[PDB]
Design a protein around this nucleic acid. Sequence first.
RNA 1: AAAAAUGAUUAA
RNA 2: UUAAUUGCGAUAACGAACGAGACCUUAACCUACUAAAUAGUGGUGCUAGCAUUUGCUGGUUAUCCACUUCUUAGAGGGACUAUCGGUUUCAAGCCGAUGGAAGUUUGAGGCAAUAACAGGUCUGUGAUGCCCUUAGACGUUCUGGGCCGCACGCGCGCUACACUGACGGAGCCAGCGAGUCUAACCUUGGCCGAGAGGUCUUGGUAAUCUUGUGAAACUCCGUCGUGCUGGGGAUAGAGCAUUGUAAUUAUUGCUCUUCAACGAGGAAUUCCUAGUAAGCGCAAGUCAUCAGCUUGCGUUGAUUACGUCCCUGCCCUUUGUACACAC
Lengths: 102, 67, 141, 206, 107, 145, 145, 141, 63
Amino acid sequence: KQQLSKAAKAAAALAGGKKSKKKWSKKSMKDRAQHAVILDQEKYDRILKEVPTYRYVSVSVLVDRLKIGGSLARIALRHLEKEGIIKPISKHSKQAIYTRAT
Amino acid sequence: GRVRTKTVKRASKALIERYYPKLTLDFQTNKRLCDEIATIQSKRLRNKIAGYTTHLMKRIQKGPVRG
Amino acid sequence: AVPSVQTFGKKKSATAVAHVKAGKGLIKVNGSPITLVEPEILRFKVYEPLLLVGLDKFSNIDIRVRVTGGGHVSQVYAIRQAIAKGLVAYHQKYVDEQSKNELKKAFTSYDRTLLIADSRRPEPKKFGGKGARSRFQKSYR
Amino acid sequence: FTPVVLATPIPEEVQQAQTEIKLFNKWSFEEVEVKDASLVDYVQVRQPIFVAHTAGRYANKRFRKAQCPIIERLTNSLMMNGRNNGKKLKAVRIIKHTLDIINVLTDQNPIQVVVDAITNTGPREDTTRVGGGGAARRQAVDVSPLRRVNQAIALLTIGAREAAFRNIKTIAETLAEELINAAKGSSTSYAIKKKDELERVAKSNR
Amino acid sequence: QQQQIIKIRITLTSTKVKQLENVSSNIVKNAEQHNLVKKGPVRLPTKVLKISTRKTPNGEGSKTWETYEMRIHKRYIDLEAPVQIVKRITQITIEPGVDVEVVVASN
Amino acid sequence: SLVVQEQGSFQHILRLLNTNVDGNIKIVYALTTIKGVGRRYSNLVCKKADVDLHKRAGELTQEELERIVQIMQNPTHYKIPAWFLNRQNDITDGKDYHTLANNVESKLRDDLERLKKIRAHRGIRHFWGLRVRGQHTKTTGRRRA
Amino acid sequence: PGTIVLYAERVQDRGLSAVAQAESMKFKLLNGLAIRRAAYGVVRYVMESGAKGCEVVVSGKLRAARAKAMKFADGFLIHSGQPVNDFIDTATRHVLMRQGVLGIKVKIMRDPAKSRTGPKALPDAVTIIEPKEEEPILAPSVKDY
Amino acid sequence: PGVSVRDVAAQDFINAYASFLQRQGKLEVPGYVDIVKTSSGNEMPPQDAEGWFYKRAASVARHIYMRKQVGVGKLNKLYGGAKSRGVRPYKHIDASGSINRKVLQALEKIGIVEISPKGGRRISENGQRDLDRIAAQTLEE
Amino acid sequence: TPVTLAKVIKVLGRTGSRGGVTQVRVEFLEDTSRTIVRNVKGPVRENDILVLMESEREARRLR
RNA sequence: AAAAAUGAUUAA
RNA sequence: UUAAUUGCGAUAACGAACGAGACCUUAACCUACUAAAUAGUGGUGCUAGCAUUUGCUGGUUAUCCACUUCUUAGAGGGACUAUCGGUUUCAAGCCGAUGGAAGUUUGAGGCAAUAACAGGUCUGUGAUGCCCUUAGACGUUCUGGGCCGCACGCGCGCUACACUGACGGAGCCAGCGAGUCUAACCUUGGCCGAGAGGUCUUGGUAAUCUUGUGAAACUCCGUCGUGCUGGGGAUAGAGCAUUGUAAUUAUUGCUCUUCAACGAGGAAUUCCUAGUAAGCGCAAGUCAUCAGCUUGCGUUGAUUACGUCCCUGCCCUUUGUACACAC
Ligand SMILES: [K+]
Ligand SMILES: [K+]
Ligand SMILES: [Mg+2]
Ligand SMILES: [Mg+2]
Ligand SMILES: [Mg+2]
Ligand SMILES: [Mg+2]
Ligand SMILES: [Mg+2]
Ligand SMILES: [Mg+2]
Ligand SMILES: [Mg+2]
């Protein structure tokens, strides 16, 4: 076919090297979301108060409705199951399902 | 598609015009007859010949057939 | 001797062989009771003969199963096919067949695979692709 | 009722399922009664299944898949988005959890909720592309019952998967929320809003 | 030598199925005409030896592959015969493409 | 299942080895921010410090944080089998060492300057800015190097 | 010396061996005999020997530098299936000439009705036994000895 | 009545027996615990620093009970797994030979296994007795 | 909402540029003397029930 | 009834 | 009408041939024959170890015997769209249901016509014409280097962007293979080592041993907690080993450290209809060492469609042509 001249090949290579990274996407980022992994007194009172009347209890709903990390959600959830104010339905790792007691 | 080839068609037609009184309407004994009234190299083609023969015999029972 | 029979059940490449003989109603699989079969998300499939026919008539019969081959799920299917086949073959050989056919009716009423192994077979792979049908990515220009 | 002794102990909970088949040994298929017509004999709630896993042949015929149980049909469409091809054990476990979450958020049969979600999420009218010119057009057409229930399962599973991607909420929980939203009709669910958009487009191309 | 037992074993290895079965059947026959108790011919799984290679001698064209195969059919027979007749069976009934291997087992 | 009630004595973001270790992250993965320490080294140092592994890097008292600093400073003197370190048997003194936050890129400069001042092929490839571990360069690694 | 033997035995139906015909034709081309005569002669010899069909292909450069390939055929000659491996025998031979290399391809269909090994007829060749037509007797006419 | 370690849940049997050895405290921990990562395929040590050795000891002892004889290399192929090789695919890598060897060597020190004059390591009478005691207690947990 | 429930009684044929649309004849459930020809996207048997958002249009793309 | 231009010389 | 120049048939054609089919291999079905410590199972018949009103294991063709269900290979049987209900120039045929292991030629292949391409290969060939070269060789060997070189562009791919996840503990499962005596091949097991590995023996010329290739994806139980994060593991530093005479331009493996782009990807474009797609690994080929490749093997196992000629093409017929180097 048509061979390009050396100057044209150099121009193309230099253009490719100078070229910026054309990311072909719209990059939208959500804002910083923090959850108090450390459990202070006010958050514990909020737990002991409003965790009852919750129709559905799980790590995700504890995270969404209360700014606590998944680790604190899991340990506090098992603590509430020990206190017996929530009864289980399906017991399984990676997914917990809990409702009101009695 | 289950269109039979001319080898099956002509073998069946000759068998009908050669052993019509002995041939019987069910497949199993037409199979067990073709081994003695013919020599087919393969069991598969023997079964295909017997099946076309018994289908034509069903056709022959309710009226004649051209050819 | 003791009244006994034996059967087998087959998935893709898994095979389970069942020794079925009269006793006190003892069920084991690979020397383990069938209630311990893993996974517990598919332990129901091996429970299904126990829940369909009704374990009331399992009192006289005892079954011991040795299963090999295939994967975990393929073993589950071969076990449940083998236990169903053994139960209905023990009925055919040593019981009146009114109960044999009613078992067969209930089994076919639930799944055909309880008695008849799946005829699906692995398809050999062909050159030019990773699988039997799939091809390597063609390139033009 | 009336458990019998056995030489090998059978657990009491599974002993009660001898009476009739009980999905996950927790619900029976009796009194499901898919109420919106034109989807009967296509949503399979008559034959009971103990679990959503049975390797039956439902692809060698055109309409054979309609006889596959509706729960397993939903399960087999959760085995995605490529990395999740296979792992039907995982999909069945997710289905079991999402039905449990239905039965704890609503005093309703989860199968009833699922079939109501499918009936409410199957589009009744769509379009098709006609015209080879540069300005190609759409023509509204009716939608068969089978395609309605297939598109309903697709939109429910896809919306649950997208809502599960990159957030703290488990797939089982976001699928349960999607199913609860769809079984009543709330337009906060992906499948409802997608169906309503598509039907509106067929209306505009009528 | 004084008409005693050898605990002899005979292996037949070949690709030719018919040329293998005929010799094995003849050995079986000579057993009964000399009222000989034995183990019948145990047939090994038919070994297959495959070679897959490109058909093209150069490196051009569609990447078509071809596979060629051996089939090794094997039969081991455990015989318990006197000394004066193990030679009678081993020197006769030999066919082209088929070889006979004999080991005095002691296990 | 321990549900601990504590006052406002939780220690928020804290400084070790001239590096910002932030609380609310487990102590192992909080220490990994320091240059020269990875997940394995952080785990081993934390475990040799006789502290709990679930202290969120904010419950650590001062004294048990200087214990962990000294363990990082002298890895060998706390029964580490010495194949676990970062710089074993160096050119200068041949003593098995582990570089820390501000010293990893310093020792990197010293080693690169040494290889350049000796004109060894790896040093000259580094000076040009090419790949030194023997990779092909025809197509891959273009947009930056 | 005295245990290894070598026996040479005469080839019957020598027209049916593609190897022998290919060698003989190659010697004809070396001797200078015309290509069309050599191929038609070997075909005639094969067919008169009793083989069902014959095939001789001469590929190379015959009159001009530009290549071509004649073909000489006769009789019945199948091309696909197991009977290729069961009734077809082929030979390929190179022929040095001044201009170049000529390829000689010989393919032979031997008559299935002959020989005592393998199939004695082609697959699907169905043959029927004659009915031996007889007269029906009217009366029973039971017989005794 | 009679019960052995085949009718109990394997995972709960392993955990309970590991805690039983934890209470006995005679397993003679190797010393390089708190360091090793148990397999070349792994990239992290066990998250339970104080019991992973006891868990491995129970699992190995159970596995030896399961089979006729099992060697160190067979434990290595067992307890090994996939290894992440960065931009390369995965492959199976055997477990730490030294750890598997030390667990086995600890087993005869606690007396459960013997030389196995034909093969590798096999279960003894006293070890059998200790396992079926923990089987009885685990069953009546 | 006036949604119309109609039972198919005949499949006329496979229509469309790519053949993705079905020509069907449907009678109405409330009165079985109100036959009309419609276009259906998905697969259809006989004796299947459809839902019609507008119940008055005749399907084009005949013969 | 949407749009659709081009293709160097010689070589049975 | 068929997948078919497959047939029904019509007929200035008649009878024929090749191809298609038929054929051969291979995955399925055989409680039917032959059998088997190189495949098995069972009798616990011999001793026993454990728990205890009976189950699980150790030594079983000299510590025995019986039987081929599982396994293998010989000869076969089996399916022929069988029967039935529909439809037809009522013929070839096609659509449903019932049986059956199997009802898209049952699945997948192997072979595969005449005619041609200035298709590729003279670097596979002691296949080869002609031209060139032939002692300072374009011959053949030896040392070193290169074939890998990087401003750049493109085509196969691998790993990813994560919670349907990562990490840790445990449960625990294939099929196809291959493998030394003209010499070190496949390696059990024991011991040392974090590991990679090292050392001492063993078995296997192989359904006997590696090997039940105890593979991975998978399942359970815990840690993480939506943060380019503990996702990802590029780049780079330091050390320890193996192959090989020889490892620097890093063969590869292992340990610690560094921890980059990458937030699901514009125009555009590839493969695929059921045990298929896809995910997952394993073996073999090349191999002294080296897989991100290929050829197979099994594991887990979708969705959607049973259609059309819209796009891209193919076959037959009719037609137009100023084309035949053939739009
Ligand atoms: K695949
Ligand atoms: K050289
Ligand atoms: Mg053919
Ligand atoms: Mg494993
Ligand atoms: Mg031109
Ligand atoms: Mg190259
Ligand atoms: Mg990181
Ligand atoms: Mg390659
Ligand atoms: Mg033009």
